[PDB]
Coordinates of C-alpha atoms and ligand atoms in Angstrom, one line a residue:
Chain A
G1 CA 207.2 72.7 103.6
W2 CA 203.9 74.5 104.2
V3 CA 203.5 78.0 102.9
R4 CA 201.0 80.3 104.6
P5 CA 198.2 81.8 102.5
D6 CA 198.6 85.4 101.5
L7 CA 196.1 88.2 102.3
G8 CA 192.7 87.6 100.6
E9 CA 193.4 84.1 99.6
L10 CA 191.5 82.0 102.1
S11 CA 188.3 84.1 101.3
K12 CA 188.5 82.9 97.7
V13 CA 185.6 80.9 96.3
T14 CA 186.7 77.6 94.8
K15 CA 185.2 74.7 92.8
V16 CA 184.8 71.2 94.3
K17 CA 184.6 68.0 92.3
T18 CA 182.7 65.3 94.1
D19 CA 180.8 62.1 93.3
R20 CA 177.5 62.7 95.2
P21 CA 174.4 63.3 93.0
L22 CA 172.8 66.7 93.0
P23 CA 169.7 66.7 95.2
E24 CA 166.7 67.3 93.0
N25 CA 164.4 68.5 95.8
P26 CA 166.3 69.9 98.8
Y27 CA 163.3 71.9 100.0
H28 CA 160.8 69.0 99.8
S29 CA 158.4 71.1 97.9
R30 CA 155.0 69.6 97.0
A31 CA 153.5 69.8 93.5
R32 CA 152.7 73.4 92.6
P33 CA 149.1 74.4 91.9
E34 CA 147.9 74.8 88.3
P35 CA 148.1 78.4 87.1
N36 CA 145.2 80.3 85.8
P37 CA 144.5 80.1 82.0
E38 CA 145.9 83.0 80.0
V39 CA 143.6 85.4 78.1
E40 CA 143.9 84.9 74.4
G41 CA 142.1 85.8 71.1
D42 CA 141.3 89.0 69.2
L43 CA 139.2 91.7 70.8
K44 CA 135.8 91.8 69.2
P45 CA 133.5 94.8 69.7
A46 CA 131.0 94.5 72.6
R47 CA 127.8 92.6 71.8
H48 CA 125.0 95.2 71.4
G49 CA 127.0 97.9 73.1
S50 CA 126.8 98.7 76.8
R51 CA 123.9 96.2 77.7
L52 CA 123.2 98.5 80.7
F53 CA 119.5 99.1 81.2
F54 CA 118.1 101.0 78.2
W55 CA 121.4 102.2 76.6
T56 CA 121.6 101.1 73.0
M57 CA 125.3 101.9 72.8
Chain Y
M1 CA 109.5 109.6 68.5
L2 CA 112.3 111.8 67.4
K3 CA 110.0 113.9 65.2
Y4 CA 108.1 115.1 68.4
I5 CA 111.0 115.4 70.8
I6 CA 113.2 117.5 68.5
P7 CA 110.5 120.2 67.9
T8 CA 110.2 120.4 71.7
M9 CA 113.9 120.9 72.3
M10 CA 113.7 123.4 69.4
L11 CA 110.8 125.2 71.1
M12 CA 113.2 125.9 74.0
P13 CA 115.5 128.2 71.9
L14 CA 112.4 129.7 70.3
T15 CA 111.2 131.1 73.7
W16 CA 114.8 131.9 74.8
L17 CA 115.6 134.0 71.7
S18 CA 112.3 135.8 71.1
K19 CA 111.5 139.5 71.6
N20 CA 109.9 141.2 74.6
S21 CA 106.4 141.2 73.3
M22 CA 106.3 138.1 71.0
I23 CA 107.2 135.2 73.3
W24 CA 103.6 134.2 73.9
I25 CA 102.5 134.5 70.2
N26 CA 105.4 132.5 68.8
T27 CA 105.4 129.8 71.4
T28 CA 101.6 129.4 71.1
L29 CA 101.9 129.2 67.3
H30 CA 104.6 126.6 67.2
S31 CA 103.1 124.4 70.0
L32 CA 99.9 124.4 68.0
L33 CA 101.9 123.3 65.0
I34 CA 103.3 120.4 67.1
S35 CA 99.8 119.6 68.3
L36 CA 98.7 119.4 64.6
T37 CA 101.6 117.1 63.7
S38 CA 100.8 114.9 66.6
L39 CA 98.0 113.2 64.6
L40 CA 100.5 110.9 62.9
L41 CA 100.4 108.7 66.1
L42 CA 97.0 107.4 65.0
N43 CA 98.7 104.8 62.7
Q44 CA 97.4 101.9 64.8
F45 CA 97.1 98.3 63.6
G46 CA 94.6 95.7 64.7
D47 CA 97.2 93.2 65.9
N48 CA 100.6 95.0 66.3
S49 CA 101.3 98.1 68.3
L50 CA 103.2 100.9 66.5
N51 CA 106.9 100.3 67.3
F52 CA 109.5 103.0 66.5
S53 CA 112.9 101.8 67.7
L54 CA 114.5 99.8 70.6
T55 CA 113.5 102.5 73.1
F56 CA 110.3 104.2 71.9
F57 CA 106.9 102.7 70.9
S58 CA 103.3 103.6 71.0
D59 CA 100.3 101.3 71.3
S60 CA 96.7 102.5 71.3
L61 CA 96.9 103.4 75.1
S62 CA 99.6 106.0 75.0
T63 CA 98.4 107.7 71.8
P64 CA 95.4 109.6 73.4
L65 CA 97.6 110.6 76.3
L66 CA 100.3 111.9 74.0
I67 CA 97.8 113.9 71.9
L68 CA 96.3 115.3 75.2
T69 CA 99.7 116.4 76.4
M70 CA 100.8 118.1 73.2
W71 CA 97.4 119.7 72.8
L72 CA 97.3 120.8 76.5
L73 CA 100.6 122.8 76.3
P74 CA 99.2 125.6 74.1
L75 CA 96.2 125.9 76.5
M76 CA 98.4 126.5 79.5
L77 CA 100.3 128.9 77.3
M78 CA 97.2 131.0 76.6
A79 CA 95.8 130.9 80.1
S80 CA 99.1 131.6 81.9
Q81 CA 99.7 135.1 80.4
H82 CA 97.2 137.3 82.3
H83 CA 98.9 136.8 85.7
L84 CA 102.4 137.1 84.3
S85 CA 102.0 140.4 82.4
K86 CA 103.6 142.3 85.2
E87 CA 106.5 139.9 85.3
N88 CA 110.2 140.2 84.5
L89 CA 111.0 138.9 81.0
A90 CA 113.7 136.4 82.2
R91 CA 111.2 135.0 84.8
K92 CA 108.5 134.7 82.1
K93 CA 110.9 132.9 79.8
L94 CA 111.9 130.6 82.8
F95 CA 108.2 129.8 83.4
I96 CA 107.7 128.9 79.7
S97 CA 110.9 126.9 79.7
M98 CA 109.8 124.7 82.6
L99 CA 106.4 124.2 80.8
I100 CA 108.3 123.0 77.7
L101 CA 110.6 120.8 79.8
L102 CA 107.6 119.2 81.6
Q103 CA 105.9 118.5 78.2
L104 CA 109.1 116.9 76.9
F105 CA 109.4 114.7 80.0
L106 CA 105.7 113.7 79.7
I107 CA 106.0 112.7 76.0
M108 CA 109.2 110.8 76.9
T109 CA 107.2 109.0 79.7
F110 CA 104.2 107.4 78.0
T111 CA 106.2 106.3 74.9
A112 CA 109.3 104.7 76.4
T113 CA 109.2 100.9 75.8
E114 CA 111.8 100.0 78.5
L115 CA 110.2 100.2 81.9
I116 CA 113.1 101.9 83.8
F117 CA 113.2 104.6 81.2
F118 CA 109.5 105.2 82.0
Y119 CA 110.4 105.3 85.6
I120 CA 113.2 107.8 85.0
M121 CA 110.9 110.1 83.1
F122 CA 108.1 109.5 85.6
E123 CA 110.4 110.9 88.4
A124 CA 111.8 113.6 86.1
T125 CA 108.3 115.1 86.0
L126 CA 108.7 115.9 89.7
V127 CA 111.2 118.8 89.4
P128 CA 109.4 121.2 87.0
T129 CA 106.0 120.7 88.7
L130 CA 107.5 121.5 92.1
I131 CA 109.4 124.5 90.8
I132 CA 106.3 125.9 89.1
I133 CA 104.1 125.4 92.2
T134 CA 106.6 126.7 94.7
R135 CA 107.8 129.7 92.6
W136 CA 104.8 131.0 90.7
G137 CA 102.2 130.3 93.4
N138 CA 100.2 132.9 95.2
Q139 CA 99.6 131.8 98.8
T140 CA 101.7 131.0 101.8
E141 CA 101.1 127.2 101.9
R142 CA 102.6 126.7 98.4
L143 CA 105.9 125.6 100.0
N144 CA 104.0 123.0 102.2
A145 CA 102.0 121.9 99.2
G146 CA 105.2 121.2 97.2
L147 CA 106.8 119.4 100.2
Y148 CA 103.7 117.2 100.6
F149 CA 103.5 116.4 96.8
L150 CA 107.2 115.6 96.4
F151 CA 107.5 113.5 99.6
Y152 CA 104.3 111.5 99.0
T153 CA 105.5 110.7 95.5
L154 CA 109.1 109.8 96.3
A155 CA 108.2 107.9 99.5
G156 CA 105.8 105.8 97.5
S157 CA 108.0 105.3 94.5
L158 CA 111.5 104.4 95.6
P159 CA 110.4 100.8 96.4
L160 CA 109.1 100.8 92.8
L161 CA 112.7 101.4 91.6
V162 CA 113.9 98.5 93.9
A163 CA 111.3 96.1 92.6
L164 CA 111.9 97.1 89.0
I165 CA 115.6 96.5 89.3
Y166 CA 114.9 93.1 90.9
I167 CA 112.5 92.3 87.9
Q168 CA 115.3 93.2 85.5
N169 CA 117.7 90.9 87.4
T170 CA 115.3 88.0 87.4
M171 CA 113.5 88.1 84.0
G172 CA 116.6 89.4 82.3
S173 CA 115.0 92.4 80.6
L174 CA 112.7 95.3 81.4
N175 CA 111.5 95.9 77.8
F176 CA 107.7 95.9 77.6
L177 CA 107.6 94.0 74.4
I178 CA 109.6 91.1 75.8
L179 CA 107.6 91.2 79.1
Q180 CA 104.5 90.5 77.1
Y181 CA 106.1 87.2 75.9
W182 CA 108.4 86.3 78.9
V183 CA 105.8 86.8 81.7
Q184 CA 105.6 84.2 84.5
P185 CA 102.9 83.4 87.1
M186 CA 103.7 84.9 90.5
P187 CA 102.8 82.4 93.2
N188 CA 101.5 82.7 96.8
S189 CA 104.1 83.9 99.2
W190 CA 104.9 86.9 101.4
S191 CA 107.7 88.0 99.1
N192 CA 105.4 88.2 96.1
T193 CA 102.9 90.1 98.3
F194 CA 105.5 92.8 99.1
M195 CA 106.6 92.8 95.4
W196 CA 103.0 93.6 94.5
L197 CA 102.9 96.3 97.2
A198 CA 106.1 97.9 95.9
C199 CA 104.9 97.8 92.3
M200 CA 101.5 99.2 93.0
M201 CA 101.6 101.8 95.9
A202 CA 103.7 104.2 93.9
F203 CA 101.2 104.5 91.1
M204 CA 98.2 104.6 93.5
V205 CA 99.8 107.3 95.6
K206 CA 100.3 109.3 92.4
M207 CA 96.8 108.4 91.2
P208 CA 95.7 109.1 94.1
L209 CA 94.2 106.4 96.4
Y210 CA 91.9 107.3 99.3
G211 CA 93.8 107.9 102.5
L212 CA 96.9 108.7 100.5
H213 CA 95.1 111.6 98.7
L214 CA 96.1 114.3 101.1
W215 CA 98.7 115.7 98.8
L216 CA 96.2 116.6 96.1
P217 CA 93.9 119.3 97.6
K218 CA 97.0 121.1 98.8
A219 CA 99.0 121.0 95.6
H220 CA 96.0 122.1 93.5
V221 CA 94.8 125.1 95.6
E222 CA 98.2 126.8 95.9
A223 CA 99.5 126.1 92.4
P224 CA 99.1 128.6 89.5
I225 CA 96.5 127.9 86.8
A226 CA 98.9 126.1 84.4
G227 CA 100.2 124.0 87.2
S228 CA 96.6 123.1 88.2
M229 CA 95.9 122.1 84.6
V230 CA 98.9 119.9 84.2
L231 CA 98.3 118.4 87.6
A232 CA 94.7 117.6 87.0
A233 CA 94.7 116.5 83.4
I234 CA 97.9 114.6 82.8
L235 CA 100.1 114.1 85.8
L236 CA 97.5 112.0 87.6
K237 CA 97.4 109.6 84.6
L238 CA 101.0 108.5 85.0
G239 CA 99.8 106.3 87.8
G240 CA 97.0 104.8 85.6
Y241 CA 99.3 104.2 82.7
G242 CA 101.9 102.6 85.0
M243 CA 99.2 100.4 86.6
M244 CA 98.1 99.3 83.1
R245 CA 101.7 98.5 82.2
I246 CA 102.7 96.8 85.5
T247 CA 99.7 94.6 86.2
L248 CA 101.0 92.3 83.4
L249 CA 103.7 90.9 85.6
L250 CA 101.5 90.6 88.8
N251 CA 99.4 87.5 87.9
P252 CA 97.8 85.5 89.4
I253 CA 98.2 87.3 92.7
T254 CA 95.9 90.3 92.0
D255 CA 92.6 88.4 92.3
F256 CA 93.0 88.2 96.1
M257 CA 95.5 91.1 96.8
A258 CA 93.5 93.9 95.2
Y259 CA 90.5 93.7 97.6
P260 CA 91.5 96.4 100.2
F261 CA 92.4 98.9 97.5
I262 CA 89.0 98.3 95.9
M263 CA 87.3 98.9 99.2
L264 CA 89.4 102.0 99.9
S265 CA 88.6 103.4 96.5
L266 CA 84.8 102.7 96.7
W267 CA 84.3 104.2 100.1
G268 CA 86.8 107.0 99.2
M269 CA 84.8 108.0 96.1
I270 CA 81.7 108.1 98.3
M271 CA 83.4 110.2 101.0
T272 CA 85.0 112.6 98.5
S273 CA 81.7 113.3 96.8
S274 CA 80.3 113.9 100.2
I275 CA 83.2 116.3 100.8
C276 CA 82.4 118.1 97.6
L277 CA 78.9 118.6 99.0
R278 CA 80.3 120.7 101.9
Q279 CA 83.3 122.5 100.4
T280 CA 83.8 126.3 100.9
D281 CA 86.1 126.7 97.9
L282 CA 85.9 126.1 94.2
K283 CA 89.4 124.8 93.7
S284 CA 89.1 122.3 96.5
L285 CA 85.8 121.2 95.2
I286 CA 87.3 120.4 91.8
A287 CA 90.3 118.7 93.6
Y288 CA 88.1 116.3 95.5
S289 CA 86.0 115.6 92.4
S290 CA 89.3 114.6 90.7
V291 CA 90.0 112.3 93.7
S292 CA 86.6 110.6 93.3
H293 CA 87.0 110.0 89.5
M294 CA 90.5 108.7 90.0
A295 CA 89.2 106.2 92.6
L296 CA 86.8 105.1 89.9
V297 CA 89.7 104.6 87.5
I298 CA 91.6 102.6 90.2
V299 CA 88.7 100.2 90.7
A300 CA 88.4 99.7 86.9
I301 CA 92.1 99.0 86.5
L302 CA 92.3 96.7 89.5
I303 CA 89.4 94.4 88.4
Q304 CA 91.2 94.0 85.0
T305 CA 88.4 93.1 82.5
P306 CA 88.4 94.4 78.9
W307 CA 85.3 96.6 79.5
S308 CA 86.9 98.0 82.6
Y309 CA 90.0 98.9 80.6
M310 CA 88.0 100.7 77.8
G311 CA 86.1 102.6 80.5
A312 CA 89.2 103.5 82.4
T313 CA 91.0 105.0 79.4
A314 CA 87.9 106.9 78.3
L315 CA 87.5 108.1 81.9
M316 CA 91.1 109.4 82.1
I317 CA 90.8 111.4 78.8
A318 CA 87.4 112.8 79.6
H319 CA 88.2 113.7 83.2
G320 CA 91.4 115.4 82.1
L321 CA 89.6 117.7 79.7
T322 CA 86.7 118.4 82.2
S323 CA 88.9 119.1 85.2
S324 CA 91.2 121.4 83.1
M325 CA 88.2 123.4 81.9
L326 CA 86.7 123.7 85.4
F327 CA 90.0 124.9 86.7
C328 CA 90.2 127.5 83.9
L329 CA 86.7 128.8 84.8
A330 CA 87.6 129.0 88.5
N331 CA 90.8 130.9 87.7
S332 CA 88.9 133.4 85.5
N333 CA 86.5 134.1 88.4
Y334 CA 89.5 134.4 90.7
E335 CA 91.1 136.9 88.4
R336 CA 87.8 138.9 88.4
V337 CA 87.1 138.9 92.1
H338 CA 90.6 138.3 93.6
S339 CA 89.3 135.8 96.1
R340 CA 89.0 132.0 96.1
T341 CA 85.7 131.6 98.1
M342 CA 82.8 130.1 96.1
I343 CA 80.1 131.9 98.2
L344 CA 81.8 135.3 97.8
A345 CA 80.3 136.1 94.3
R346 CA 76.9 135.0 93.1
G347 CA 74.6 135.4 90.2
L348 CA 77.2 135.8 87.5
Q349 CA 74.7 134.6 84.8
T350 CA 73.1 138.1 84.9
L351 CA 76.5 139.7 84.1
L352 CA 78.5 137.1 82.2
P353 CA 76.0 135.1 80.1
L354 CA 78.4 133.4 77.7
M355 CA 80.7 132.4 80.5
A356 CA 77.6 131.0 82.3
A357 CA 76.9 128.9 79.2
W358 CA 80.5 127.5 79.3
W359 CA 79.9 126.9 83.1
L360 CA 76.7 125.0 82.2
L361 CA 78.5 122.9 79.5
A362 CA 81.4 122.0 81.9
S363 CA 79.0 121.1 84.7
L364 CA 76.9 119.0 82.4
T365 CA 79.8 117.0 81.1
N366 CA 81.2 116.6 84.6
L367 CA 78.0 114.8 85.8
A368 CA 78.4 112.4 82.8
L369 CA 75.7 113.6 80.4
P370 CA 75.3 111.3 77.5
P371 CA 76.6 110.7 74.8
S372 CA 79.8 112.4 76.0
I373 CA 82.8 110.3 76.7
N374 CA 82.6 110.9 80.4
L375 CA 79.5 108.6 80.7
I376 CA 81.1 106.3 78.1
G377 CA 83.9 105.6 80.5
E378 CA 81.7 105.7 83.6
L379 CA 79.2 103.3 81.9
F380 CA 81.8 100.8 80.9
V381 CA 83.3 100.7 84.4
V382 CA 79.7 100.4 85.9
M383 CA 79.0 97.3 83.7
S384 CA 82.4 95.8 84.5
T385 CA 81.9 96.3 88.3
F386 CA 78.4 94.8 88.1
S387 CA 80.0 91.8 86.5
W388 CA 82.5 91.7 89.3
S389 CA 79.8 92.0 92.1
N390 CA 76.2 93.1 92.3
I391 CA 76.4 95.4 95.3
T392 CA 78.8 97.6 93.3
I393 CA 75.7 99.0 91.5
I394 CA 74.5 100.3 94.9
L395 CA 77.9 101.9 95.5
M396 CA 78.2 103.3 91.9
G397 CA 74.7 104.7 91.9
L398 CA 75.2 106.5 95.2
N399 CA 78.3 108.0 93.7
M400 CA 76.4 109.2 90.7
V401 CA 73.7 110.8 92.7
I402 CA 76.1 112.7 94.9
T403 CA 78.1 113.7 91.8
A404 CA 75.1 115.3 90.2
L405 CA 74.3 116.9 93.5
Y406 CA 77.6 118.6 93.9
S407 CA 78.0 119.6 90.3
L408 CA 74.7 121.4 90.3
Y409 CA 75.3 122.8 93.7
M410 CA 78.5 124.3 92.4
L411 CA 76.7 125.7 89.3
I412 CA 73.9 127.2 91.4
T413 CA 76.2 128.8 94.0
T414 CA 78.5 130.3 91.4
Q415 CA 76.1 131.3 88.6
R416 CA 72.6 131.5 89.8
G417 CA 70.7 133.5 92.4
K418 CA 70.6 137.2 93.2
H419 CA 73.9 138.9 92.2
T420 CA 76.2 140.3 94.9
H421 CA 75.9 143.9 95.7
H422 CA 79.3 145.3 96.7
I423 CA 81.4 143.7 94.0
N424 CA 81.6 146.0 91.0
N425 CA 84.6 145.0 89.0
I426 CA 83.1 142.2 86.9
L427 CA 84.5 143.1 83.5
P428 CA 83.1 141.3 80.4
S429 CA 84.8 138.2 79.3
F430 CA 87.9 138.6 77.1
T431 CA 88.3 136.9 73.7
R432 CA 91.2 135.0 75.4
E433 CA 89.1 133.3 78.1
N434 CA 86.2 132.5 75.8
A435 CA 88.7 131.0 73.2
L436 CA 90.2 128.9 76.0
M437 CA 86.8 127.7 77.0
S438 CA 85.9 126.8 73.4
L439 CA 89.2 125.0 72.9
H440 CA 88.4 122.9 76.0
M441 CA 84.8 122.2 74.9
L442 CA 85.1 121.5 71.2
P443 CA 87.4 118.4 71.2
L444 CA 85.4 117.0 74.2
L445 CA 82.1 117.2 72.4
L446 CA 83.6 116.2 69.1
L447 CA 85.0 113.0 70.5
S448 CA 81.4 111.7 71.0
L449 CA 81.2 111.5 67.2
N450 CA 84.2 109.2 66.9
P451 CA 85.0 107.6 70.3
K452 CA 86.8 104.6 68.9
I453 CA 90.2 106.4 69.1
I454 CA 90.3 106.6 72.9
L455 CA 89.1 103.1 73.8
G456 CA 92.4 101.6 74.8
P457 CA 94.7 99.0 73.3
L458 CA 92.0 96.2 73.3
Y459 CA 89.3 98.0 71.3
Ligands
PC1_501 C1 103.3 105.4 100.3 C2 103.7 104.9 101.7 C3 103.7 103.4 101.8 C4 104.6 102.8 100.8 C5 104.4 101.3 100.7 C6 105.2 100.6 99.6 C7 105.1 99.1 99.6 C8 105.4 98.4 100.9 C9 106.5 97.4 100.8 C10 107.7 97.9 100.1 C11 109.0 97.1 100.5 C12 110.2 97.6 99.8 C13 110.4 97.2 98.4 C14 110.4 95.7 98.2 C15 110.6 95.2 96.8 C16 110.6 93.7 96.8 C17 111.1 93.1 95.5 C18 111.4 91.7 95.7 O1 112.3 91.1 95.1 O2 110.7 91.1 96.6 C19 110.9 89.7 96.8 C20 112.0 89.5 97.9 C21 112.3 88.1 98.1 O3 113.4 88.0 99.1 P1 114.9 87.8 98.6 O4 115.0 88.4 97.2 O5 115.8 88.3 99.6 O6 115.1 86.3 98.4 C22 115.4 85.7 97.1 C23 114.2 84.9 96.7 N1 114.0 83.5 97.5 C24 113.0 83.8 98.5 C25 113.5 82.5 96.5 C26 115.3 83.0 98.1 O7 111.4 90.1 99.1 C27 112.2 90.7 100.0 O8 113.4 90.8 99.8 C28 111.5 91.3 101.1 C29 110.6 92.5 100.7 C30 110.0 93.2 101.9 C31 111.0 94.2 102.5 C32 110.6 94.7 103.9 C33 111.3 96.0 104.3 C34 110.6 97.3 103.8 C35 109.3 97.5 104.4 C36 108.4 98.6 103.8 C37 109.0 100.0 103.8 C38 108.2 101.0 103.0 C39 108.6 102.5 103.1 C40 108.6 103.0 104.6 C41 108.9 104.5 104.7 C42 107.9 105.4 104.0 C43 108.2 106.9 104.1 C44 108.4 107.4 105.5

């Protein structure tokens, strides 16, 4: 009493219930480096203009 | 200094919109009005220099030079109109426009507080002078003279730009007011030696220094009359003003680095006076006289004592007026005889007596006749150099003897003796030439009455 699978049935994707814990780190990745700080704050006007040689603005 | 720049940039549309026959009249008129309004710069205080804004200022050193520039422009305007009467109107307006542009750059040079602004204007004066010399000259060697002048100046002065940018990057600012209060001693090393060289050789090539003076007697004898005036009377003083401004940051290295330049200038003033004793041309004679007097100013600035500074600034103002007048007289004679040789025409006192009187006055003030400001400056430098070392009185006195010798040799060969026979186009002097001579003389003699206004910032 075994019925053969139809066309397209053995390629179906199923769900498996098992008792093993999920591996937290399968890739054995090290600690990630600290990211750069993000630019924040309101944009004030430039202090004393261009500050390039003699230019006052 | 916006009340003196804006009338200059308004003088430009005045000569570019005038009529065919009224360009000279209107431009002379309004440049004389600007020269009158220049007197407001004399608001000097005993402790604080006159400061205008963040970019412009005027101490007691740049005030006589500014008054000299904006007084000199009308004089070139009067004297540069007899050899341009047969000229196209557009070319005449172009000549006048370059003169106004050069005056604008000069008044934006002395006044600028920030040092790199002074450098930008100091190199901006190169273009109109070269254009005037190489376009409105008369001889073949004017192109070579322009090449020599431009390349001596720029080859001496691009290291100055590099050193100035380094000074900006080290001290933090190139403002002159801050540099009076943020100056540091510069120690003994090769790097400071080459910094001193880069800071000084630009101004002493422009000044000029002996050995580096080869650009001057070429650029003077092939320039027009106005170009010769503005070369002799103002454009040589950019080096002196720059030296006075830039020796502030070059302590305490100058007391044993400035020896070879002092020796060069002393033997150079002796040798150039000796050259003037054997010169076949009037213009080259005046050029080498200028080289000698500028060597004197170099020594005065280099030894850096207060009496030397007073004598130096009086010497630059007096030499500017005297050399400009001598060039004017030589150009009047060149217009009359159409040749540059001093020995060609002789005995002009019998034909042109009043011009002979002006020749006498110019030659007397050139050999430092007291109480004129020429001997005021020469005298102060002489006392300062005697304080420096005693054998300088030997050198200075030899220079004075040869100076009197060549001035009176020039006067005798041009004005006295039997008149020439085959030259018969000596017209009487115009009112224009006599008026120009009187405009050169009368401030120069009047400044002996009140000489306290040209005695530098430490009067
Ligand atoms: C008129 C003709 C002759 C012109 C002579 C002009 C002066 C001669 C020397 C000029 C050198 C170039 C400008 C140097 C400015 C130095 C400013 C500075 O920061 O100095 C300290 C710096 C200090 O070095 P640093 O800045 O690298 O080090 C940092 C400071 N420490 C030492 C504390 C770590 O000096 C230098 O960098 C070296 C300066 C000498 C460079 C030598 C190469 C040029 C040689 C001269 C060429 C002249 C023109 C030749 C062509 C003429 C036309 C054909």
